Amino acid sequence: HDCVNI
Amino acid sequence: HDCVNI
Amino acid sequence: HDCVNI
Amino acid sequence: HDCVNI
Amino acid sequence: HDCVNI
Amino acid sequence: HDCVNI
Amino acid sequence: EQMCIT
Amino acid sequence: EQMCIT
Amino acid sequence: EQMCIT
Amino acid sequence: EQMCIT
Amino acid sequence: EQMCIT
Amino acid sequence: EQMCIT
Numbered sequence: 001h002d003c004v005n006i
Numbered sequence: 007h008d009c010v011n012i
Numbered sequence: 013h014d015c016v017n018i
Numbered sequence: 019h020d021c022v023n024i
Numbered sequence: 025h026d027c028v029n030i
Numbered sequence: 031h032d033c034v035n036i
Numbered sequence: 037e038q039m040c041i042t
Numbered sequence: 043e044q045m046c047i048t
Numbered sequence: 049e050q051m052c053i054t
Numbered sequence: 055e056q057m058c059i060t
Numbered sequence: 061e062q063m064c065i066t
Numbered sequence: 067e068q069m070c071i072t
């Protein structure tokens with residue numbers, strides 16, 4: 001899936 | 007890479 | 013309580 | 019802008 | 025799972 | 031309430 | 037829709 | 043830290 | 049469509 | 055750190 | 061729309 | 067830690 005780091 | 011489509 | 017609108 | 023601090 | 029419908 | 035924990 | 041930090 | 047959809 | 053934290 | 059909807 | 065973390 | 071769209 002498409003993610004971003006947080 | 008800071009973004010994802012929603 | 014801080015918000016965004018999606 | 020449509021942002022919150024996390 | 026740590027999720028919300030958006 | 032419908033929440034994620036970050 | 038509103039998404040809020042508690 | 044919690045983010046909730048109202 | 050969900051936003052999930054991992 | 056911020057989350058923004060753009 | 062996009063969700064972006066900065 | 068990641069936020070992912072599923």
Ligand SMILES: [Fe+3]
């Ligand atoms: Fe990666």
Ligand SMILES: [Fe+3]
């Ligand atoms: Fe990477």
Ligand SMILES: [Fe+3]
Binds near residue numbers: 007
């Ligand atoms: Fe990457």
